[PDB]
Tab-separated table of C-alpha atoms in Angstrom:
chain	number	residue	atom	x	y	z
A	1	UNK	CA	-0.324	-0.243	-0.260
A	2	UNK	CA	1.758	3.725	0.695
A	3	UNK	CA	2.852	5.301	3.476
A	4	UNK	CA	1.857	7.323	6.083
A	5	UNK	CA	2.155	10.982	7.297
A	6	UNK	CA	3.521	11.187	10.251
A	7	UNK	CA	3.999	13.248	13.542
A	8	UNK	CA	5.269	13.362	16.916
A	9	UNK	CA	5.413	16.144	19.376
A	10	UNK	CA	7.424	15.775	22.414
A	11	UNK	CA	8.656	18.943	25.673
A	12	UNK	CA	11.088	20.981	24.098
A	13	UNK	CA	12.198	21.834	27.249
A	14	UNK	CA	13.757	25.148	28.919
A	15	UNK	CA	14.228	27.849	26.606
A	16	UNK	CA	12.794	26.372	23.930
A	17	UNK	CA	15.308	24.577	22.628
A	18	UNK	CA	16.828	21.049	22.225
A	19	UNK	CA	14.367	18.624	24.357
A	20	UNK	CA	12.817	18.761	27.177
A	21	UNK	CA	12.812	16.006	30.140
A	22	UNK	CA	10.020	13.715	29.377
A	23	UNK	CA	9.736	10.119	29.700
A	24	UNK	CA	6.772	8.969	27.865
A	25	UNK	CA	7.845	11.432	24.970
A	26	UNK	CA	10.998	9.401	24.901
A	27	UNK	CA	8.985	6.324	25.294
A	28	UNK	CA	6.899	6.314	21.974
A	29	UNK	CA	9.660	7.853	20.480
A	30	UNK	CA	11.253	5.546	20.667
A	31	UNK	CA	8.299	2.895	19.602
A	32	UNK	CA	8.385	4.879	16.408
A	33	UNK	CA	12.291	4.360	15.638
A	34	UNK	CA	12.035	0.631	16.206
A	35	UNK	CA	8.451	0.285	14.398
A	36	UNK	CA	10.691	1.309	11.428
A	37	UNK	CA	8.331	3.587	9.633
A	38	UNK	CA	9.153	7.114	8.216
A	39	UNK	CA	7.991	10.038	10.835
A	40	UNK	CA	8.693	13.203	11.738
A	41	UNK	CA	9.347	15.324	15.474
A	42	UNK	CA	8.651	18.907	16.468
A	43	UNK	CA	10.355	20.070	19.755
A	44	UNK	CA	6.869	22.076	20.659
A	45	UNK	CA	7.320	24.755	23.859
A	46	UNK	CA	3.835	24.237	25.997
A	47	UNK	CA	4.000	28.250	26.444
A	48	UNK	CA	3.071	28.382	22.420
A	49	UNK	CA	1.130	26.165	21.553
A	50	UNK	CA	2.099	25.478	16.939
A	51	UNK	CA	-0.503	25.794	14.224
A	52	UNK	CA	-1.647	22.146	13.930
A	53	UNK	CA	-2.222	22.055	18.572
A	54	UNK	CA	-3.711	24.884	18.235
A	55	UNK	CA	-7.851	23.232	18.530
A	56	UNK	CA	-6.805	20.558	21.013
A	57	UNK	CA	-5.795	22.280	23.628
A	58	UNK	CA	-7.034	22.598	27.070
A	59	UNK	CA	-4.131	20.562	29.332
A	60	UNK	CA	-3.426	18.464	27.685
A	61	UNK	CA	0.426	16.415	28.263
A	62	UNK	CA	3.561	16.095	25.850
A	63	UNK	CA	3.088	12.723	24.096
A	64	UNK	CA	1.034	13.989	21.418
A	65	UNK	CA	0.912	12.130	17.895
A	66	UNK	CA	-0.737	13.967	14.819
A	67	UNK	CA	-1.234	11.087	12.325
A	68	UNK	CA	-2.816	11.164	8.807
A	69	UNK	CA	-3.940	15.414	10.121
A	70	UNK	CA	-5.998	13.342	13.422
A	71	UNK	CA	-4.483	14.546	16.208
A	72	UNK	CA	-4.497	11.983	19.151
A	73	UNK	CA	-3.442	11.798	22.409
A	74	UNK	CA	-2.644	9.357	25.961
A	75	UNK	CA	0.419	8.082	25.076
A	76	UNK	CA	-1.124	4.928	26.278
A	77	UNK	CA	-3.828	4.597	23.909
A	78	UNK	CA	-0.957	6.263	21.307
A	79	UNK	CA	1.535	3.003	21.532
A	80	UNK	CA	-1.451	0.051	20.582
A	81	UNK	CA	-2.371	2.057	18.127
A	82	UNK	CA	0.692	2.362	16.529
A	83	UNK	CA	1.196	-2.074	17.289
A	84	UNK	CA	-2.178	-2.539	15.465
A	85	UNK	CA	-1.214	-0.015	13.079
A	86	UNK	CA	1.829	-1.225	11.722
A	87	UNK	CA	1.107	-5.204	11.297
A	88	UNK	CA	3.819	-7.335	11.964
A	89	UNK	CA	4.058	-7.889	7.212
A	90	UNK	CA	5.500	-4.435	6.661
A	91	UNK	CA	6.691	-4.283	10.151
A	92	UNK	CA	7.929	-5.496	13.432
A	93	UNK	CA	5.994	-6.353	16.536
A	94	UNK	CA	7.340	-4.887	19.512
A	95	UNK	CA	4.941	-6.949	22.409
A	96	UNK	CA	6.960	-8.393	24.576
A	97	UNK	CA	5.360	-11.937	25.332
A	98	UNK	CA	6.145	-12.247	29.413
A	99	UNK	CA	3.372	-10.027	30.694
A	100	UNK	CA	6.301	-9.561	33.708
A	101	UNK	CA	8.411	-7.786	31.479
A	102	UNK	CA	6.212	-4.636	31.976
A	103	UNK	CA	5.202	-5.450	35.855
A	104	UNK	CA	8.971	-5.404	37.337
A	105	UNK	CA	9.395	-1.656	35.531
A	106	UNK	CA	6.058	-0.910	37.361
A	107	UNK	CA	6.843	0.959	40.602
A	108	UNK	CA	10.336	2.123	40.266
A	109	UNK	CA	9.609	5.380	39.051
A	110	UNK	CA	6.765	5.542	42.004
A	111	UNK	CA	9.261	3.937	44.410
A	112	UNK	CA	11.584	6.950	42.700
A	113	UNK	CA	10.347	9.954	42.549
A	114	UNK	CA	8.974	9.734	46.052
A	115	UNK	CA	13.421	9.530	46.806
A	116	UNK	CA	13.957	11.981	44.709
A	117	UNK	CA	11.160	14.022	46.611
A	118	UNK	CA	13.411	16.017	48.920
A	119	UNK	CA	11.813	14.128	52.228
A	120	UNK	CA	13.064	13.288	55.636
A	121	UNK	CA	11.957	9.586	55.075
A	122	UNK	CA	15.649	8.593	53.415
A	123	UNK	CA	17.362	6.131	53.604
A	124	UNK	CA	13.918	3.681	53.955
A	125	UNK	CA	12.690	5.221	50.453
A	126	UNK	CA	16.487	4.292	49.246
A	127	UNK	CA	15.978	0.793	50.657
A	128	UNK	CA	12.552	1.360	48.959
A	129	UNK	CA	14.482	2.249	46.266
A	130	UNK	CA	16.747	-0.447	46.461
A	131	UNK	CA	14.449	-3.018	46.831
A	132	UNK	CA	12.650	-2.383	43.647
A	133	UNK	CA	15.885	-2.591	41.455
A	134	UNK	CA	17.138	-5.712	43.432
A	135	UNK	CA	14.013	-7.230	42.231
A	136	UNK	CA	14.489	-5.584	38.547
A	137	UNK	CA	17.881	-6.617	39.207
A	138	UNK	CA	16.068	-10.422	39.864
A	139	UNK	CA	14.866	-10.503	37.954
A	140	UNK	CA	16.849	-9.608	34.678
A	141	UNK	CA	19.331	-12.423	36.280
A	142	UNK	CA	16.725	-14.775	36.328
A	143	UNK	CA	16.817	-17.307	32.609
A	144	UNK	CA	12.833	-16.832	31.306
A	145	UNK	CA	10.763	-19.606	30.191
A	146	UNK	CA	12.501	-19.464	26.308
A	147	UNK	CA	15.766	-19.483	27.946
A	148	UNK	CA	15.611	-22.416	30.899
A	149	UNK	CA	17.448	-25.692	29.703
A	150	UNK	CA	16.258	-27.954	31.875
A	151	UNK	CA	18.627	-30.912	30.903
A	152	UNK	CA	21.538	-28.742	32.612
A	153	UNK	CA	23.281	-29.717	34.749
A	154	UNK	CA	24.723	-26.513	35.620
A	155	UNK	CA	25.247	-25.374	39.813
A	156	UNK	CA	24.464	-21.730	37.820
A	157	UNK	CA	22.485	-20.679	35.002
A	158	UNK	CA	22.883	-17.202	34.965
A	159	UNK	CA	20.269	-14.756	32.150
A	160	UNK	CA	22.496	-13.668	28.833
A	161	UNK	CA	19.737	-11.487	27.413
A	162	UNK	CA	20.647	-8.391	26.476
A	163	UNK	CA	17.272	-6.364	27.142
A	164	UNK	CA	14.528	-6.766	29.733
A	165	UNK	CA	12.497	-9.549	27.399
A	166	UNK	CA	14.666	-11.368	24.438
A	167	UNK	CA	17.632	-10.186	22.794
A	168	UNK	CA	15.204	-7.271	20.577
A	169	UNK	CA	13.810	-3.967	23.034
A	170	UNK	CA	10.661	-4.212	23.443
A	171	UNK	CA	7.458	-1.862	24.192
A	172	UNK	CA	8.640	-3.342	28.225
A	173	UNK	CA	12.328	-1.882	27.426
A	174	UNK	CA	10.601	1.528	25.927
A	175	UNK	CA	8.050	1.782	29.184
A	176	UNK	CA	11.549	1.241	31.821
A	177	UNK	CA	14.772	2.442	29.734
A	178	UNK	CA	13.482	6.078	29.699
A	179	UNK	CA	12.285	6.237	33.394
A	180	UNK	CA	15.645	4.434	34.326
A	181	UNK	CA	17.713	7.267	33.118
A	182	UNK	CA	15.995	9.814	34.700
A	183	UNK	CA	16.054	8.021	37.558
A	184	UNK	CA	20.256	7.691	37.311
A	185	UNK	CA	20.922	11.141	36.204
A	186	UNK	CA	18.424	13.170	38.983
A	187	UNK	CA	19.092	10.341	42.088
A	188	UNK	CA	22.773	10.951	41.836
A	189	UNK	CA	22.574	15.119	41.039
A	190	UNK	CA	20.294	15.642	44.077
A	191	UNK	CA	20.751	13.043	45.974
A	192	UNK	CA	24.069	11.321	45.118
A	193	UNK	CA	22.725	8.212	44.796
A	194	UNK	CA	24.339	4.886	41.934
A	195	UNK	CA	22.701	2.232	41.094
A	196	UNK	CA	24.886	-0.179	42.985
A	197	UNK	CA	27.083	-1.677	40.798
A	198	UNK	CA	26.812	-5.287	42.800
A	199	UNK	CA	23.346	-4.665	41.269
A	200	UNK	CA	25.203	-6.803	38.234
A	201	UNK	CA	21.849	-7.747	36.319
A	202	UNK	CA	20.422	-4.089	35.952
A	203	UNK	CA	23.924	-3.082	35.239
A	204	UNK	CA	24.447	-5.972	32.866
A	205	UNK	CA	20.940	-3.955	31.292
A	206	UNK	CA	21.509	-0.809	31.166
A	207	UNK	CA	25.150	-1.008	29.211
A	208	UNK	CA	22.829	-2.893	26.088
A	209	UNK	CA	20.856	-0.556	26.367
A	210	UNK	CA	23.620	2.833	25.637
A	211	UNK	CA	24.903	0.404	22.686
A	212	UNK	CA	22.469	1.293	21.167
A	213	UNK	CA	21.238	4.819	18.857
A	214	UNK	CA	16.974	3.847	19.574
A	215	UNK	CA	17.831	3.702	23.088
A	216	UNK	CA	20.904	6.352	23.250
A	217	UNK	CA	19.599	8.762	20.874
A	218	UNK	CA	17.111	8.912	21.781
A	219	UNK	CA	17.427	10.245	25.763
A	220	UNK	CA	17.157	13.723	26.991
A	221	UNK	CA	19.960	15.869	27.582
A	222	UNK	CA	21.613	14.959	31.232
A	223	UNK	CA	21.049	19.119	32.138
A	224	UNK	CA	17.905	18.817	30.452
A	225	UNK	CA	17.144	16.318	33.455
A	226	UNK	CA	18.299	17.557	36.169
A	227	UNK	CA	16.973	21.073	36.274
A	228	UNK	CA	13.516	19.699	36.014
A	229	UNK	CA	13.888	17.942	39.745
A	230	UNK	CA	15.623	20.311	41.179
A	231	UNK	CA	12.998	22.382	42.364
A	232	UNK	CA	11.530	19.124	43.688
A	233	UNK	CA	14.810	19.050	46.237
A	234	UNK	CA	12.917	22.157	47.735
């Protein structure tokens, strides 16, 4: 058939130049990249929305998708829609086969959000976050139901999967990786917190991510993330 005209709008951030901090905006950015379809990206300052954003602008939030002249909102509706409209024949299927891959990377941003919100509770929060990281690390270390090798007599079997679900990026990776980036930048900057290196699984996971352009090149500048979280430390 024919090619769709697709435009993705994401928060500009800071001076209206470069891309701003929005994990869900980067997540949609990665999804369209993995699909391989032809699309364009626009950095949009919130104060002066461009002409195309005139009619549907009450308080609508940064991730915007303009598809074939039709505006779309709610990035969750957008994610499945792109997966639905981009069919396996001509485009990949990024949905993960195991639901746990989605579930491990869910509350971690919430546990971080309470942590980075500067507050007296600290060590319980950091331990709360560290437990969430170990759950991610323990899940990443544990082999999936596709790679157990039941006959193996090896005492120790440690998974070597590059990413969350398989050896290919998935929607769970698009959700988790932008959130993980914000966690590292903001926490080290404002809370002097680093993911402990003894968390071999998640540290391995982050290393494979930076080796791929789809994640690293869609990341906002470090300064953009820090400035959004300067206020929350008040």
